[PDB]
From Swiss-Prot:
Listed name of the protein: Retinol-binding protein 4
Disulfide bonds: C4-C160, C70-C174, C120-C129
Gene from which the chain derives: RBP4
One example GO MF annotation: retinal binding
Compartments where located: Secreted
Function: Retinol-binding protein that mediates retinol transport in blood plasma. Delivers retinol from the liver stores to the peripheral tissues. Transfers the bound all-trans retinol to STRA6, that then facilitates retinol transport across the cell membrane.
Taxonomy, superkingdom: Eukaryota
UniProt GO BP: cardiac muscle tissue development; detection of light stimulus involved in visual perception; embryonic organ morphogenesis; embryonic retina morphogenesis in camera-type eye; embryonic skeletal system development; eye development; female genitalia morphogenesis; gluconeogenesis
Amino acid sequence: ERDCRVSSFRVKENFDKARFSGTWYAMAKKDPEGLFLQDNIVAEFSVDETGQMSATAKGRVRLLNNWDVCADMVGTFTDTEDPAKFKMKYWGVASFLQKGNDDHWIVDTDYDTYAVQYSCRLLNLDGTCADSYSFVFSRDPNGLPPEAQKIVRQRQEELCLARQYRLIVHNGYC
Ligand SMILES: CCCCCCCCCCCC(=O)O
Ligand SMILES: [Cl-]
Ligand SMILES: [Cl-]
């Protein structure tokens, strides 16, 4: 019944980069193929005078053969015609960390409590996403209040992802 075409997904009306700046703690993640950020994931958003949004992120990543390292990542956001949809160029402060360019959508936020982010890296031929990821962010590292949690669950369902998240732990690893 429900529409899972990426082209159908609503995103945050009149998204305000300035209001979104500051520290966001990842509470939950839906992983893409070949997942990178594992847990202890914290993002820092900024906007400069030209209106350009950028971010840094810290988190544990586990490169294969199970060697744990705290990745330090950088992202810069190129605007699109939709104020809530961006292209995010990202890299690690270390050369060998994963680099790339992903769609970065702010699906919903109230700026001071919760955010829902979404990226489809690759479409299916029917317009659904073949390879997606999504972060749920909280301003408070101890988690969302119930009213926000309930809104977020609705958005997770609208993205056709609600069954597919895992919780992100924060235990000072970094
Ligand atoms: C919120 C901006 C984060 C900086 C870009 C790093 C994001 C790349 C990792 C996301 C995909 C994954 O973690 O599997
Ligand atoms: Cl609930
Ligand atoms: Cl579920």
